[PDB]
Amino acid sequence: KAAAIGIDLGTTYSCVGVFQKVEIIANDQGNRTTPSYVAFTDTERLIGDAAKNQVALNPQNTVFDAKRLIGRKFGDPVVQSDMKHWPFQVINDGDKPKVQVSYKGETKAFYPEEISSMVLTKMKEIAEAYLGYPVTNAVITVPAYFNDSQRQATKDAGVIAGLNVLRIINEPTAAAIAYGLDRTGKGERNVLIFDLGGGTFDVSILTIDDGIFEVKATAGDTHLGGEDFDNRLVNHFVEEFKRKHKKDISQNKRAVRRLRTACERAKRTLSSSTQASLEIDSLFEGIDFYTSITRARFEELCSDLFRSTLEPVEKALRDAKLDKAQIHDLVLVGGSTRIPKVQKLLQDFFNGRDLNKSINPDEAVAYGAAVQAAILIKS
Ligand SMILES: Nc1ncnc2c1nc(NCc1ccc3ncccc3c1)n2[C@@H]1O[C@H](CO)[C@@H](O)[C@H]1O
Ligand SMILES: [Cl-]
């Protein structure tokens, strides 16, 4: 009744927080972020880690990227383009996309908001296990570029999940609230949010004038994120396996998916150490894949992708009509900002200035959404 949660409903990962400072809630697996994945099996519906974990064995019925579909028409160019690359089926029901899956031996179709509602239900349950009581008040975040239809469908996913959605707020706004950047006093505060997540890259320039938020500019690449760096590691390893065993593994989907899972793990380790070891038992034709990679080789494999994050920053400043020196704060959002080379590129681009990464980048949005939920529920 007097409690409220903040939920970052992300494209690839979701996060839930409660202001108590903010407490970001760890899930049953102990993770502070949860995959935005829903898997339909012969016996049940799996949400989060359990869904992401069995993707190699059930790709057709493991749904992710519902956020790319939510609030869009089926005939939308983005939907038609995205459909080609997903292993699950997207169908047309009255010009609204639905994901069609096999669930308990039968064909079933779900609206993007229904799928999102299952991720939201998991986030709500995670919060409930932490607080020891039912909680329904929540603030859910969306990208600043989301249109009214996308915001309404996101809100609908909240209602389907049993949540009272206090407000739908922009992700870069939530990240600025997490750092208290709306509480610095009278006058204009210019904030740049650099968000590099699992699958998308968003740059936002915000102006906070006497506590009031204005989005002056948005730029980025909707199709650039953590998964592209995992794939550069996949390509490198496929090439390594070819040189070591004279065999191409590319056409064996299970082997590729397994290698990609190991690559995402090695990438995360490389943010905190200078070397990482891949330990894959029987990757292809009964051959084990035990190898290592250095932070330096990883930076080289992703160099062009890391560098391409700077052009949208330049375009956002241009559109905001602001120079680098006019930006008061530089805020890192998204799990991929954890990469030291990404941080170095943005710091060098901002003439050696400090970057805000004190709050875990993949938690800053839910942190901010929880602060906003606490303000709305108290008032
Ligand atoms: N230390 C890092 N170094 C480079 N990248 C990183 C990263 N920690 C994360 N995410 C946080 C995360 C994601 C999954 C996890 N599973 C298990 C345990 C911790 C986990 C933490 N990322 C990437 O951010 C995106 C959204 O999570 C994904 O592409 C993820 O690979
Ligand atoms: Cl380090």
**Selected catalytic residue, list 49, 171, 230, 362:** 171
End-to-end distance of the chain based on CA atoms, in angstroms? Answer: 13
CA count, 13 A, side-chain hemisphere, 377: 21
Among candidate residues 76, 96, 118, the one where a domain is terminated: 118
- C-alpha–C-alpha distance, residues 158 and 155, integer Å: 5
Experimental technique used to determine this entry: X-ray
- C-alpha–C-alpha distance, residues 271 and 175, integer Å: 22
Residue 296 sits in which domain range? 225-308
Residues in the chain: 379
Q: What angle do CA 16, 100, 85 make, to 5 degrees?
A: 80
Which long-range CB contacts under 8 A does 107-111 form with residues at least 24 apart? 108/40, 110/63
We report the CATH number of the domain holding residue 257 as 3.90.640.10
Contact (Cβ atoms closer than 8 angstroms) between residue 43 and residue 104: yes
Instruction: Tell me which residue has its CA closest to atom 20 in ligand 1.
Output: 31
Instruction: Tell me which residue has its CA closest to atom 19 in ligand 1.
Output: 31
Buried b (16+ CB within 10 A) or exposed e, 191-227: bbbbbbbbbbbbbbbbbbeeeebebbbbbbbeebbbb
Collapsing DSSP to helix, strand or coil, 200 comes out as: coil
Q: How far is the CA of 176 from the centre of ligand 1 (A)?
A: 21
Same domain, 193 and 45: no
Contact (Cβ atoms closer than 8 angstroms) between residue 15 and residue 33: yes
| β-bridge partners, 330 | 192
Q: What angle do CA 220, 225, 231 make, to 5 degrees?
A: 140
**Selected catalytic residue, list 67, 122, 155, 341:** 67
Same domain, 123 and 48: yes
We report the CATH number of the domain holding residue 55 as 3.30.420.40
Contact (Cβ atoms closer than 8 angstroms) between residue 122 and residue 48: yes
Q: Quick one: which of 224, 192, 209 has its CA closest to 356?
A: 192
We report the CATH number of the domain holding residue 74 as 3.30.30.30
Q: Quick one: which of 160, 96, 81 has its CA closest to 124?
A: 160
Q: Quick one: which of 239, 240, 254 has its CA closest to 285?
A: 254
Q: How far is the CA of 73 from the centre of ligand 1 (A)?
A: 31
CA count, 13 A, side-chain hemisphere, 214: 11
User: Encoding tokens for residue 146?
Assistant: 């989301």
Phi-psi region at 220: left, alpha or beta (left = phi > 0; alpha = psi -120 to 50): left
Please state, in angstroms and as integers, the Cα–Cα distance from residue 156 to each residue in 52, 67, 114, 120, 160, following that order: 24, 13, 8, 11, 6
Helix axes 253-269, 226-245, angle to 10 degrees: 120
State the resolution, in angstroms.
1.9
Q: Which residue numbers belong to the known binding site? A: 10-13, 67, 198-200, 264-271, 335-338
Q: What angle do CA 308, 314, 316 make, to 5 degrees?
A: 110
Please state, in angstroms and as integers, the Cα–Cα distance from residue 129 to each residue in 9, 133, 170, 281, 365, following that order: 19, 7, 27, 36, 21
Domain total of the chain? 4
Instruction: Tell me which residue has its CA closest to atom 2 in ligand 1.
Output: 268
| Residue 173, C-beta contacts closer than 8 angstroms, at least 6 positions apart | 144, 206, 213, 215, 368
Q: Quick one: which of 143, 204, 230 has its CA closest to 332?
A: 204
| Contact 268 CB / ligand 1 (< 6 Å) | yes
- Cα-only R_g, the chain: 21
Look at the block and give the residue holding tokens 């028409």: 73
Contact (Cβ atoms closer than 8 angstroms) between residue 177 and residue 368: yes
Contact (Cβ atoms closer than 8 angstroms) between residue 278 and residue 237: yes
Same domain, 363 and 346: no
